[PDB]
Point group: D3
Chain length 60, copies 6
């Protein structure tokens, strides 16, 4: 499987490392797929590039 | 709904703010969906990362 | 610009047609970009393929 | 956060339900983010639409 | 590398097979990357789901 | 067609230029589509944002 995760910028390298690990395990375990077949892409969004309800997520 | 918009880098924060607003309204109005259910992601492309017809968009 | 919109399945062709139009206008007007430069992709999600808070959107 | 997962077609509804749950928990726990802020999109690929090394995944 | 290609529905399985091959070779050769490291995803769009300039691609 | 290519950061501008060209030609030739109808987006991933088997690609 291939996962792309969009998260707001601001997290530590460590947190992102954990995220990649935990999500990979969750996917592998969920589908009974080899862990090595799981590929994860993290894409960070600048606070001014994410909107919710037409408002910058940063201010809502 | 969830919208991801790919635009070439170079726009002001303001223009991007407007973009997020107008697009969210257009989506909400178009589908009769609550505005708060609309999430927008803007992804900027470096001029050297967008091609059209095999040529850098920057030079075509 | 290039926009990809993820929406739950269930809308009429007409509504999707409107969505494509309104969103294209909103983008063109927002960035002062030629309308013809706006490309829109609609991607529908089966009700069982969209989760919110770990629950199928269909039941939350 | 917003996650999009690309998986080959063939899994049961149940497996996909589990996937959405486990992945949402993994993301929430990994980033200390409210579970309700996690949105997951599953996108299935037809066996003839996924290539690895230039070969259809189906035959490699 | 990971490539996702959005194309309008209507092509034969064969054409899509070729597409996956040629694109994989082009990527591998372009970056001097092992062919086996190239993964390709083809995503087809229904004619009513692709807009250009606010009009359905089908009618423009 | 519209192609989005995810590659790890580190390549020269030149290599990316070539990539855009070769991939565009491969797509145009593969589908017998006008070269000018091919649009390519390159998205670079920071080494700490790409995971394989739950491990940072950088260290596997």
């Amino acid at each position: 499987p291939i996962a792309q995760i969009h998260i707001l910028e601001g997290r530590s390298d460590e947190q992102k490392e954990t995220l990649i690990r935990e999500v990979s395990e969750a996917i592998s375990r969920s589908l009974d797929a080899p862990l090595t077949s799981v590929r994860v892409i993290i894409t960070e969004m600048a606070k001014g590039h994410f909107g919710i309800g037409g408002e910058l997520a940063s201010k809502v």
